[PDB]
Structure formats: structure tokens, C-alpha cells
Amino acid sequence: PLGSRHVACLARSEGLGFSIAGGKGSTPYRAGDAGIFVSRIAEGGAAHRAGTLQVGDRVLSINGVDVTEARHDHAVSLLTAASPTIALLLERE
Amino acid sequence: QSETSV
């Protein structure tokens, strides 16, 4: 009786095509939740083309780094660090 | 800025 989990494997373009909100360094996304959530997906971008993400997914892990408690701009750094791919672990429900 | 785009 709680969410279910998925993996998003994204290749960087000229970005990943999605936005995040919340976390400890910023304003929450949900009433009583300092987690890092997907605020929106860019139509036509890398992420929309993969169809793996979804507005409202909690981000738990970015390339192995547990961000359930990380500051907003720390994950922002993790999401834009030059690397061939970005693996995301996500919670949906 | 509340969201960040990546």
C-alpha cells in the first residue's frame, strides 16, 4: 500500500527535457513533502521521447546517488553533470 | 525560481 518503482535511462542532448521541484533547498512540490519531484516534461525532449518519466514522480536516486533528502540544487548539479547517460530511480502512485 | 529545468 504505497507507490511503485521504475527506472529512467536518459541520454543528454543540447538537456534531459524535464524539470524538478521541491527538495530541501527549495519550495516543496506537495503539501507536506520535501522530496524531489518531476514538475514537468518538455514536449519533444529526451525524456518525453523515452516515455519513462511522468509529472509527479518522486526522484529517489540519480546515477546511484540517493536524493530522497538532498537539497534541490544538489540534485540539479547531479542532473546536469556531464555524463553519457542519467539513470533515474522513480516512485509513482 | 521554484522549478529548475535540466
Explain the overall architecture:
- The complex is a heterodimer of chains A (93) and B (6).
- Chain A contains two helices and six strands, in the order βββαββαβ.
- Chain A is of the alpha+beta class and 93 residues long.
- Chain A has a single domain, classed as Pdz3 Domain (Roll), CATH 2.30.42.
- In chain A, strands 1, 2, 3, 4, 5 and 6 form a six-stranded antiparallel β-sheet that branches.
- Chain A is globular.
- The termini of chain A are close together.
- Chain B has 6 residues and is mostly beta strands.
- The chains are: A alpha+beta (93), B mainly beta (6).
- Chains A and B meet through β2 and α2 of A and β1 of B.
Key phrases:
heterodimer; A: 93 residues; alpha+beta; Pdz3 Domain; 2 helices; 6 strands; 15% helix; B: 6 residues; mainly beta; 0% helix; rod-shaped
SSE arrangement:
The complex is a heterodimer of chains A (93) and B (6).
Chain A: E1 4-11, E2 18-22, E3 36-41, H1 46-50, E4 58-62, E5 65-66, H2 72-80, E6 85-92
Antiparallel strand pairs in A: 1-6, 2-3, 3-4, 4-5, 4-6
Chain B: E1 3-5
